[PDB]
Design a binder for this molecule. Structure first.
Ligand SMILES: N[C@H](C(=O)O)[C@H](OCc1ccccc1)C(=O)O
Ligand SMILES: N[C@H](C(=O)O)[C@H](OCc1ccccc1)C(=O)O
Ligand SMILES: N[C@H](C(=O)O)[C@H](OCc1ccccc1)C(=O)O
Lengths: 407, 407, 407
């Protein structure tokens, strides 16, 4: 079987056969038939995310405790914050280049219930230190898991340096077992990726059926302004920073191919952690960097979302007719990067970041005009999700590759 | 101590001392006193179910991946479906041989709230793939655990055949650790089984006290119609299929003794998984079969239940006086087997399988007449439960032994 | 760094800097600035409790199954019950010595909703057997964890004495891995303790700011009675039971220093289990004993709390001016120890014990006279909490040290 080129065969063939069933009216025929097979690929990928993160990090933290992780962390965080600053500013620039929401229309009535406010920042940061590390594992919670795997990984290094060889014996057993699990999930990530072409096919067969035949109108200018923005993010920020650190862009892209396409159809950043990690091991990076930077990046580094929040804020302010302060769009840029940090763990964050970025400008989702305009964006949001998720994993790999060269 | 005949001693003694306290009115004195000792034995048994299943299946998947597990799995499923088909039809045949519900009385008022409808089949089948496999373990969920153990066990076998002997070194360590846990619970099961005769005593001391002195009247005909059906299930379908597959029935029965009797007093098919599994290993069956077919069978193969649903539907339709379609009791048979698959994981399925098999014939529990008659069955439901749970586990062992001979 | 004296340098400075901020109004400034650092420390400790308890007890159940554990447990329980009986009677004796509640004022009408009643005893005991051992781990549940670790450890020992060396091979592998984790958590308890000085400083900085400057008046007589009582507990019961058992009290206090001081600033018996456990290991005691008698003591042996319940009953009855039965304060003492067994696992028990000790005397929290007095105590409750939690862990160490010398 061709494989990995079979995904692309299923991608193009699906996107057309869904789009054809979309304009013909069979959107909810696809939902009750084709979709479950596309979900199956997502479920199987998600299955691996917890073991592969915990395992490959305890193993990963056999690596110079402070000088690595500490400086790796500091660099990857400084990378993440600056790329997200670019992402939003390019989204603003693209929404001034285009004009999404030219028509001051939009009928008013039937709208948002306003997402719950982000928890106090102190109670977000204090929460990266888990209280029951079995608990964190037992339900999602990547951030407390990252903390625990590093603190266990550093301890088990300090254990294998013990002058007692019952201590250095038992510590070696545990680490190997945990490494067993690590390697096991990477073997299943090859299995789950064999089903990908059936899953990929069935995923865009639904997105193009339910939201594709709705991409026309003023919303076409949104989808274009976002996607051109996302393309320019890839070329202007990723390729340039990749070149300026001496790692070949196309050799990077050839390796990233698997992780990119699963992120594009899964529309889950943390969901495609197993594929983005395997693609980083397959890329030659050590587990001391990638086992840490990738899951952290699937939680803080949202470049595609930060760009989408650029153009979405403008859209709504254009749908109402707000002047957007001839000078103070630097507030939309500031609280878009501050959103990612102050939302960190808190689940369903994509809706609550945009909520506080829209409130930052002065367009709360509570005023029925702002909300009716946001409602029209949500008619084509799965289309925009694909492109923005795909950039959310690119930044992860790109930052991981830069930290790999520096450290 | 005599032991394993100590169970039979406590059973006969307990059932008499329960039944004697039953007709003397001290049913709630047994609830508040004898009962907890019966609960302890169930608690301790349940305790081992999660580790023993997960452990002995990762270990269990050290066995030719496709040709075994696949064909094992296909056979056992084809077995399960056809045994469930016989069971319901034998229940129909036993309900036409007897006449449960001769009196068209039953006073109306005070009945069911109608159980929750079974989740859409695609969100039951997709649910067999877990998302957080640690979470699967964290709270019950035998089905997604089975899927993960097997997917881990296939991964850990492919890992051991690697040309790198750091990867095989770490694979072996993990497998053996997991196998430590496997053997651990099996050694515990021997202990918990030493408490069995006290637990056994205290359980039928309750069931006969609370529902025993209630088994008189038209309900005696039901209990006789179900139990003669359960006896004939073992004799006509198990002892025939066992013999026709070249394994001695009595040699099988002698080995099944422990598993049979705890299932009869626990009334939990998954609850007596460690005893049915220990009895399978002690039977000499390999972990490549029994470690997969037994926890699957405590979730799909409910022959005793499917048989009970035959006579229960007939009881309600005779209480009302419905004709039961002179020909179309095939619809009762059909939806009984399709209840087992379409319920799978979903908790409290015993009521929801019967809710839809009754709805299939045309007797909804929403109708105050149907539900008034169904309320009378529940007054002797734990009497019926013992017999049906005991046949639920037999077929799991019977199927396991048939697959062992075949594969 | 000086260390373990840098804790003391922070405690004194923090107690004065909180107290100074308190009588100057800036209590709620300290809550929103200093307090988080104090929390970080407590979160970090609580993080270890669940692995450290489970691990160092499967490993700790490498030791003569019955003769040890059985007799160990039966000693430590009889120990626990007698020390808790002393504590409450030293509470009554210190409350008759002082007179907390001279003034029969207290204005009425702003009071307690009455804490949920303690679950029936049989469902407390039956609940010490967990039903899903992974469950118990995944969420708190120190008692059922204890029961699983001990039943695992007994089984893994019997497993290691098998004439087959595939079973003995795997059991040894499992045990080392579990011990890998055991060791690892201790290595971490050294790191988490390096943060203690800052954590300690920020913790009394709070309690002295929010409840310090409220310690004046008739509540001063309370605080004094309790603390004098708790001091007289340590001198008269621990140092006397230590001496009489042949373990130098001051050498014991040199060793207990770390666990004593964190229990005082954390106010969490079970939260400082890691510091109490490493200080038992570093004391030279065996995992056979300490690994079982320490968590079981952070769940039954609240000496300092049962002392408080003595003087609190008196204060409330003094506030109302009840005679406290010229004789029947024995019923306070009796139900005070029963409270500890009869509350076991059941969370929030602290209040739910005081509830029933007060109801025992005959002053339910529901009488808005009793309740208006009880809410006055709660004003200086964190101040009393420190002193009593530190006496709650001392008894756990003291018992373990007595049982070590005996067994
Ligand atoms: N679907 C996107 C992704 O997974 O990258 C993402 O939605 C999910 C999400 C993931 C992480 C944090 C917040 C929200 C987004 O659109 O921002
Ligand atoms: N007690 C029986 C068993 O566990 O086999 C069974 O109850 C539980 C159950 C198990 C599986 C599916 C439905 C219901 C029944 O009463 O039919
Ligand atoms: N601080 C005490 C302790 O942890 O020992 C304790 O407070 C916490 C607690 C512990 C156990 C049950 C309920 C509440 C008490 O005052 O009884």
């Amino acid at each position: 079987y061709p494989v990995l080129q079979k995904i692309l065969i299923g991608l193009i063939l699906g996107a057309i056969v869904g789009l054809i069933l979309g304009h013909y009216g069979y959107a909810h025929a696809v939902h009750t038939y084709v979709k479950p097979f596309g979900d199956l690929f997502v479920r199987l990928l998600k299955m691996l995310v917890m073991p592969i993160v915990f395992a490959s990090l305890v193993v990963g933290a056999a690596s110079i405790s402070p000088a690595r992780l500490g400086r790796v962390g500091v660099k990857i965080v400084v990378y993440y914050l600056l790329t997200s600053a670019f992402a939003v500013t390019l989204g603003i620039i693209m929404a001034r280049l285009f004009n999404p929401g030219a028509g001051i229309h939009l009928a008013v009535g039937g709208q948002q219930f306003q997402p719950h406010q982000a928890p106090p920042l102190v109670h977000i940061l204090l929460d990266i230190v888990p209280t029951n590390p079995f608990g964190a594992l037992a339900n999602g919670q990547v951030l407390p898991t990252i903390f625990f795997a590093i603190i266990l990984g550093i301890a088990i290094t300090y254990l294998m340096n013990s002058e007692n060889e019952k201590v250095r014996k038992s510590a070696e057993t545990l680490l190997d077992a945990i490494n067993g699990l690590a390697e096991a999930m990477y073997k299943i990530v090859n299995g789950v990726m064999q089903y990908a072409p059936i899953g990929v096919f069935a995923l865009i067969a639904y997105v193009m059926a339910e939201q594709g035949v709705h991409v026309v109108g003023e919303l076409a200018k949104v989808t274009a302004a976002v996607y051109v923005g996302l393309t320019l993010q890839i070329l202007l920020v990723y390729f340039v920073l990749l070149k300026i650190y001496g790692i070949d862009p196309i050799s990077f892209i050839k390796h990233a191919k698997d992780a990119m396409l699963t992120a594009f159809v899964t529309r889950s950043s943390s969901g495609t952690l197993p594929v983005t990690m395997r693609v980083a091991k397959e890329m030659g990076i050590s587990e001391g960097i990638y086992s840490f930077t990738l899951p952290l990046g699937a939680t803080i580094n949202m470049d595609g979302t930060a760009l989408y929040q650029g153009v979405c804020t403008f859209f709504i302010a254009n749908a109402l007719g707000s002047h957007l302060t001839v000078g103070q769009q630097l507030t939309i840029v500031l609280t878009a990067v501050l959103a990612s940090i102050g939302t960190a763990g808190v689940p369903g964050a994509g809706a609550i970041m945009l909520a506080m970025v829209l409130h930052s400008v002065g367009l709360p989702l509570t005023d029925p005009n702002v909300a009716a305009a946001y409602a029209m964006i949500l008619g084509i949001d799965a289309i925009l999700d694909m492109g923005r998720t795909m950039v959310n994993v690119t930044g992860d790999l790109t930052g991981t590759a830069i930290v790999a060269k520096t450290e």
